């Protein structure tokens, strides 16, 4: 199953295998039973060149998995800065909202990726967006002791 | 006989904790204090902090053993799926047997145990006190299969049981946390916390 092989190659960082599978007709938008696509997996793992070649070969920058998360959510949650930048240029919504109300800025602020927080703000990240529990990105930065991020978010309020 | 998961501080006030974030260049792991749940990517370094209030005896060891969380699974031994066991990835010539889910990183005296009666697999390190002027003993763990792996854990949740033991295998202390080996630790932690 070329889809299954492509998902695995994208997750584990096998760039040559990704290129070979797509040349052999692997569905660039294949999904597993959690709705993760090769682009989700490369974005979460941090494989920049794979993310680029998937987007060049027709990967869906807006695809949502079973949590409603886009590849930008996953790169933002992990701290993969160059991937966040490439996804925004390629058409990602900076304020894509998952099924429990997280934006990429919620996840960056919570886990504590300062440089990602700065890049998301420059692309119109919404500081007022509330998750399912009423929490803003600032609320989550305070709750997880990310002081420098809370300061940056307060200045952007 | 099922391994006990009961928390037991014991006479040395044994406790297991996690630093506030990965010192990796990305969220290779993250720990939920709300859910007492570690989230990590496959084979990444996971530092776990051990604290005691009085020195353990000479010869004490720290064991880490994975067990299934749900009563319907707990009798099944937790090991790597065949695909990861037989992969060449991470399986270069080394002390850890390739079936073991839990490895220790950076300790030549880590010992891989398979009980010849129960078939349970675990990994030991000698207990060492903290380096002078630190609070914690750090043990580096690696978790060598995804929670989702169909030939192994197959989306069943696991607990990591951390036991402080005498040389002769008497329990001195025990702490337990849930572990998930997943694609995106940062998202999975928030999603799980959101769900509860
Ligand atoms: Zn596996």
Author numbering:
A (entry chain B): 3 to 159
B (entry chain A): 125 to 320
Reproduce passages from the article.
For the initial development of DARPins as tools to study the p53 protein family we have focused on p63.
Using ITC titration experiments we measured a dissociation constant KD of 108 nM for DARPin C14 and 32 nM for DARPin G4 while no interaction with a control DARPin could be detected. The structures revealed that both DARPins bind to the DNA-binding interface and interact with the helix H3, the preceding loop and the C-terminal part of β-sheet S10 as well as residues in loop L3. All these sites are involved in and crucial for DNA binding. The loop L1 that in p53 provides an additional contact via K120 (conserved in p63), which however is not essential for DNA binding, interacts with the non-randomized scaffold of the DARPins, resulting in steric hindrance but no specific interaction. In the second DARPin-DBD complex within the asymmetric units present in both crystals, this L1 loop is disordered. All contacts between both proteins are summarized in Fig. 1D, E and Supplementary Fig. 1G-J. These data suggest that interaction with the DARPins competes with binding to DNA and that the DARPins act as a competitive inhibitor for DNA binding. Pre-incubation with either DARPin C14 or G4 resulted in complete inhibition of binding to the DNA oligomer while a control DARPin showed no significant effect. We further investigated the specificity of the selected DARPins by ITC experiments. These experiments showed that for the DBD a selective p63 binding DARPin was not identified since DARPin C14 bound to the p73 DBD with 16 nM affinity as well. Virtually no interaction was detected with the p53 DBD, however. Co-expression of DARPin C14 reactivated the transcriptional activity of p53.
